Design an enzyme around this catalytic site. Structure first.
Site, short mmCIF file in Angstrom:
data_model
loop_
_atom_site.label_atom_id
_atom_site.label_comp_id
_atom_site.label_asym_id
_atom_site.label_seq_id
_atom_site.Cartn_x
_atom_site.Cartn_y
_atom_site.Cartn_z
N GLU A 151 0.78 -1.24 0.00
CA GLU A 151 0.00 0.00 0.00
C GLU A 151 0.81 1.29 0.00
OE1 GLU A 151 -2.98 -0.60 3.07
OE2 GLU A 151 -3.74 -2.38 2.06
N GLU A 179 -5.32 -11.14 -1.86
CA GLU A 179 -6.22 -11.02 -0.69
C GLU A 179 -7.72 -10.99 -1.09
OE1 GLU A 179 -5.16 -7.68 1.67
OE2 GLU A 179 -3.00 -7.94 1.36
#
Ligand SMILES: [Mg+2]
Ligand code: NA
Length: 354
Positions: A149, A259
């Site tokens: 991220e 994910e």
């Protein structure tokens, strides 16, 4: 009345010519029926939590290996590939990283000369973290989420980067250093990924596209993009998902879906149904169609996709529940997987096994 997960055909087997089938796990889920589901359907795992920075070095020089080792041992024992999640992130990362030699947050420092020092100190800590962790798990990890991220949802700077504590203190340097250190200690063969959510949609997609082009052009070693794929029933579109994966493949990068969860709700996830039994059949069927198209796409793109991992196993455990509780006054149940809270197959299973 759906059968138990261990009674149907294996997902890994069904996708063995296409990609690994993976799940995120906690140490306590390695036995019991979760265990049995893992060994039967999956040939890859990732630590949902046990390998994030704070899980491994909660005080400087104090490494806390037990959980992570339990997961490793299980991958080893069961001949499963293992993603490492994650070497760098701006959460579940311990406070001490970002404190100056007198214990104050480096971000508060106003002197340009001490800030430079703080940048050298932070980068050194990162290097020491990465080298230690990599050196231990070098021989079992088959893919590394080197950073997680680091790209922004908007555009606060030239390169479209998250102005997190890492960037505020070091600009984009931690990213370069993260990869270079990970390559250094893991060897030329190790698969390094830059992992992120909303990789499917602009601006973020283009920023990451630009960023990996830049880094590659400067010889920073980066092998692939991790698409978190925290997705919904109708968003992102199939065309957006493909375009992102195929763009990064165009650069010679590998893609993994890292994910995946298919939330029954929008964003924010409101209104959520209060329990699993309250979830109407309608929603399991819209999910089931979504999964069918999603896995049609994945298989179609399987030249350029090596691994598909769900962010969990069966619907009894999913961080989406935190989100649902968060946005629906503390009571809320999502159901993102193809196995239900009792390890039975859901309509979506049948749509992706065929
Ligand atoms: Mg199908
Ligand atoms: Na593949």
């Amino acid at each position: 009345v759906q059968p138990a997960a261990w009674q149907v055909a294996s997902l890994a087997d069904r996708y063995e010519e296409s990609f690994d089938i993976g799940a995120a796990v906690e140490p306590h889920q390695l036995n019991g029926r979760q265990g049995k589901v893992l060994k039967h359907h999956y040939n890859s795992i990732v630590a949902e939590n046990a390998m994030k920075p704070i899980s491994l070095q909660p005080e400087e020089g104090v490494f806390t290996w037990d959980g992570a080792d339990a997961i490793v041992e299980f991958a080893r024992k069961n001949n499963m590939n293992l993603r490492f999640h994650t070497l760098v992130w701006h959460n579940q990362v311990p406070d001490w990283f970002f404190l100056d030699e007198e214990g104050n947050p480096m971000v508060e420092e106003t002197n340009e000369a001490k800030r430079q020092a703080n940048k050298e100190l932070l980068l050194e800590r990162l290097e020491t973290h990465i080298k230690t962790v990599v050196e231990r798990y070098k021989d079992d990890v088959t893919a590394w989420d080197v950073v997680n991220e680091v790209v922004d949802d908007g555009t606060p700077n030239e390169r479209g980067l998250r102005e997190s504590v890492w960037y505020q203190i070091t600009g984009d340097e931690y990213i370069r250093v993260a990869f270079e250190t990970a390559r250094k200690y893991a060897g030329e063969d190790a698969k390094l990924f830059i992992n992120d959510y909303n990789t499917e949609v602009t601006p973020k997609r283009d920023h990451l596209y630009n960023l990996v082009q830049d880094l590659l052009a400067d010889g920073v070693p980066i092998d692939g993009v991790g698409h978190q794929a925290h997705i919904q029933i109708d968003w992102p579109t199939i065309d957006e998902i493909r375009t992102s994966m195929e763009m990064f493949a165009g650069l010679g990068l590998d893609n993994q879906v890292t994910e995946l969860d298919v939330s029954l709700y929008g964003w924010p996830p409101r209104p959520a149904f209060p329990t699993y039994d309250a979830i109407p059949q309608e929603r399991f069927q819209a999910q089931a169609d979504r999964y069918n198209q999603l896995f049609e796409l994945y298989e179609e793109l399987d030249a350029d996709l090596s691994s598909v991992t769900f962010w969990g196993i069966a619907d009894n455990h999913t961080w989406l529940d935190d989100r649902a509780r968060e946005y629906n006054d503390g009571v809320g149940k999502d159901a993102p997987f193809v196995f239900d809270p009792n390890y039975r197959v859901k309509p979506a299973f049948w749509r992706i096994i065929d």
